[PDB]
């Protein structure tokens, strides 16, 4: 028929190439299961699968290993796609990671990594990145080849428990240049004993909480 091609899709890039130019919720076939994700279809050519998004404090990111593994939140809003789904997606071919940030004054910034994957659960979903470029600054490279930690699974390189103080699940080092799964505060400045906000060291700094943050992936076709 004369209607556009339809899903479910291998990824947002496949939907984009089929002529779906509007961002929104798409169905992806990830492994043996179809999962709904937000696709950013306009920025930098589109085709970006959102795997993490912060924007309004509606979802608790201080949550269980099982929730970090399986995914939590909902794709129309704040969510975390899940370590296992992201492992499945990035276990097939090369991927670019795009990090999108916005501060409370409306300034935006972007980080790109040419290469992004996770080890499986048996290797604690260790992060692998590729070459960096972007205006945001490279505040994820310090987390390369770090295991994923949550408060009951302290795998970081800190004397104490990074997740306990910075409140995310993350590939904590000692402790972080970026904390995108941290506490979303209702303004850029907040009162806390710890740098626990949604921060990016090289874009507004570790004492700031960003208004919007998101992590997106797309197949990398050289
Ligand atoms: Ca520790």
Swiss-Prot record:
Subcellular location, record wording: Secreted
Disulfide bonds listed in the record: 12-39, 162-175
Fibrinogen C-terminal domain sequence ranges: 3-221
Taxonomic superkingdom: Eukaryota
Function: May play a role in the wound healing process. May promote epidermal proliferation, remodeling and regeneration. May promote the chemotactic activity of endothelial cells and induce neovascularization. May counteract high-fat diet-induced obesity and related insulin resistance through increased energy expenditure.
Protein name: Angiopoietin-related protein 6
Organism: Homo sapiens (Human)
First-to-last residue of the parent protein present: 251 to 470 of 470
